[PDB]
Amino acid sequence: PSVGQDLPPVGGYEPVQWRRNLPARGFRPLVYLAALCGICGYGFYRALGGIQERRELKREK
């Protein structure tokens, strides 16, 4: 006979995940490049104007 030992469910189990769970997250790489140039150029607009500002302050001193 066979009683008391463990058995699978009569409905079975759910199917498991065995694949590569790899979402290609993020943006397009060109978006990273264009955002890079945007952050850069805005920084340069803050930088060089402040430098010319400092040069006029140097003149004033």
Binding site: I39, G43, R55, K58
Partner: protein
């Protein structure tokens, strides 16, 4: 005479007393980075353990190999330690608050980092085994080769400054940071930053598997606390360099709008709070950065030495000369030339 000898002690317990808890903090991080608990048996929340490390380490012996000049194995620990400790003058801590202000800041800041190679080259010569010598060779060659680009971006930083005083840079940096215009500069600086320190994305040279049980010398004792503390001083020293000349040094925001709301007059409380917030902005940048070093120490394997020299001279450094051609040119397009 009285108020300066306390001025140096408070800085000592600000730095030397902190670099130990840095070495506790790295264990706590890599614990939670690898899903385990940090040191918890030792102190209250498992703090303090660097004291238990050092005090035990001060109680072990001074066994010395027969092939080593013992004087040389005294000199190299001491000089590497004091090199990474006298690099601590013109870190700025708020406006103009250094240990000694001098108008040539970066030159000292950079020549002492230039002295930083000189101990590690000298160290492997003692105990003159062939593996022990050639390991010092392999270490020192990368240790100069990225010391190049570490040195070599410091000039393009001061192509916006044109002044060797370090605290001048931050007051220049009030209008905007330098990292946020010059973003890939930060990336190449961060890898150059972990290069000159013995960090294992890059420190292949501490391969015990390759050598006959050799990390550098296995020289241990109160010798061992010396190069060790020098290494972790080097860590947050190059973090400090990253802090001022690339990131917001002690700056957070304007904060005058807040002050005219709070105070009515200058007082020692006002100096206290402003020095607090400037030191805290410096602190928060520095403390995110020391975390980032571990955050890259965890996630990556080590290198081949071929990879390491290929990583210096072929992939990084011509891009650095491209920087040397674009930033004077961008300086040249507009008037834009900085004056002292």
């Amino acid at each position: 005479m009285i108020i300066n000898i306390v001025e140096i002690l408070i800085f000592l317990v600000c730095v030397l007393f902190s670099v130990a808890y840095l070495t506790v903090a790295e264990r706590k991080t890599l614990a939670y980075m690898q899903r385990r608990l940090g040191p918890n048996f030792v102190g209250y929340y498992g703090l303090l353990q660097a004291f238990a490390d050092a005090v035990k380490l001060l109680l072990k012996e001074i066994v010395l190999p027969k092939e080593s000049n013992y004087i040389i194995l005294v000199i190299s620990p001491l000089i590497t330690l004091i090199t990474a400790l006298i690099g601590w003058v013109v870190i700025p801590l708020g406006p103009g608050i250094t240990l000694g202000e001098l108008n040539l800041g970066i030159l000292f800041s950079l020549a002492i980092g230039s002295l930083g190679v000189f101990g590690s080259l000298l160290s492997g010569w003692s105990s003159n085994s062939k593996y022990s010598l050639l390991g010092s060779i392999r270490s020192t060659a990368q240790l100069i080769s990225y010391e190049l680009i570490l040195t070599s971006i410091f000039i393009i930083i001061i192509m916006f400054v044109s002044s060797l005083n370090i605290t001048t840079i931050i007051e220049t940096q009030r209008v905007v940071w330098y990292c946020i215009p010059l973003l890939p500069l930060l990336l190449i600086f961060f890898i150059a930053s972990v290069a000159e320190t013995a960090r294992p994305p890059f420190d292949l040279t501490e391969s015990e598997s390759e050598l006959v049980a050799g990390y550098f010398t296995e020289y241990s004792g109160s010798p061992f606390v010396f190069f060790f503390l020098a290494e972790y001083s080097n860590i947050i020293l190059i973090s400090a360099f990253n802090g001022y000349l690339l990131l917001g040094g002690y700056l957070s925001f304007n904060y005058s709008y807040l002050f005219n709301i709070l105070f009515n007059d200058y007082s020692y409380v006002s100096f206290l709070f402003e020095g607090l917030i400037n030191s805290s902005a410096y602190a928060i940048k520095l403390v995110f950065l020391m975390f980032s070093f571990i955050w890259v120490r965890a996630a990556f394997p080590r290198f081949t030495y071929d990879n390491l020299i290929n990583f210096c001279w072929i992939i990084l450094l011509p891009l650095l000369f491209g920087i040397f051609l674009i930033i004077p040119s961008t300086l040249y397009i507009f008037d834009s030339f900085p004056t002292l």
